[PDB]
């Protein structure tokens, strides 16, 4: 996260760290959506251009964390993966269209002050909140700058951007399964997700029922926090039918 701040304790209790077993390192962010299901970006697991293809046994899920590097004894919980599900139409070849994956845990995780699932949006909440100018919140342990790494979880609030402005900021083909967020050069404020934040949640707090909803997944961006560029996010509601199909079936 670039130009953000230290998270408060328990601020994002759905935040998940995807952790590589060997070598031991941060792979990506992710989010807790039930006691057995974790949501992330497909490209965290599969991206052939960079020779990336992780299997279940390569990874661990670390939940309830705050410190990036510490083993947070009596606070975090570490879970093994039973199965990975990548969207069947995930487009790693062109533009990361449908950049979404689910992970089922081997055992349910116990909820605590530090561990709690986020809501997934219904059509109405999505329609209400996914509007240009409305702000969401992105969290992660990724890079603090494009070109080091934070001591603890970082947080930044960013406004959703008008689709034509998103489209005009890039040569990459944008789809309805993406949205973009971030400040314009003229707005003064800044901030962005970065490398290592991928797979983490873009959340919004509904003013109707005061619950947090995950509207986006950190997906891609040209550099980090560049003037005139924006962060792109997987549009969670647009892919919720696939999400429900996987959880229903498996």
């Amino acid at each position: 996260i670039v130009e953000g701040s230290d998270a408060e304790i328990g601020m994002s209790p759905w935040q998940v760290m995807l952790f590589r077993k060997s070598p031991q390192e941060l792979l990506c962010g992710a989010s807790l959506i039930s006691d057995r299901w974790v949501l992330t970006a497909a490209h965290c697991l599969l991206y052939p251009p960079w020779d990336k293809n992780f299997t279940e046994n390569d990874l661990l899920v670390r939940i309830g964390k705050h410190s990036r590097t510490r083993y947070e004894r009596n606070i975090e919980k570490i879970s093994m993966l039973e199965k990975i599900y990548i969207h069947p139409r995930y487009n790693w070849r062109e533009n990361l269209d449908r950049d979404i994956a689910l992970m089922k845990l081997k055992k349910p995780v116990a909820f605590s002050d530090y561990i709690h699932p986020v809501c997934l949006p219904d059509r109405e909440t999505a329609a209400s909140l996914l509007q240009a100018g409305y702000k969401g919140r992105v969290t992660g342990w990724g890079n603090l700058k494009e070109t080091g790494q934070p001591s603890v979880l970082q947080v930044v609030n960013l406004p959703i951007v008008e689709r034509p402005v998103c489209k005009d900021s890039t040569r990459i083909r944008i789809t309805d399964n993406m949205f973009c967020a971030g400040y314009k050069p003229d707005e003064g404020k800044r901030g962005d997700a970065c490398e290592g934040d991928s797979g983490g949640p873009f959340v919004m707090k509904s003013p109707f029922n005061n619950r947090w909803y995950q509207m986006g997944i950190v997906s891609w961006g040209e550099g980090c926090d560049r003037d005139g560029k924006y962060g792109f996010y997987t549009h969670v509601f647009r892919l919720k039918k696939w999400i429900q199909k996987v959880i229903d079936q498996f």
Binding site: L26, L60, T69, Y71, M80
Partner: peptide
Amino acid sequence: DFEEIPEEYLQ
């Protein structure tokens, strides 16, 4: 600079 995690999770 990651602290080692309990061995049980790597088994």
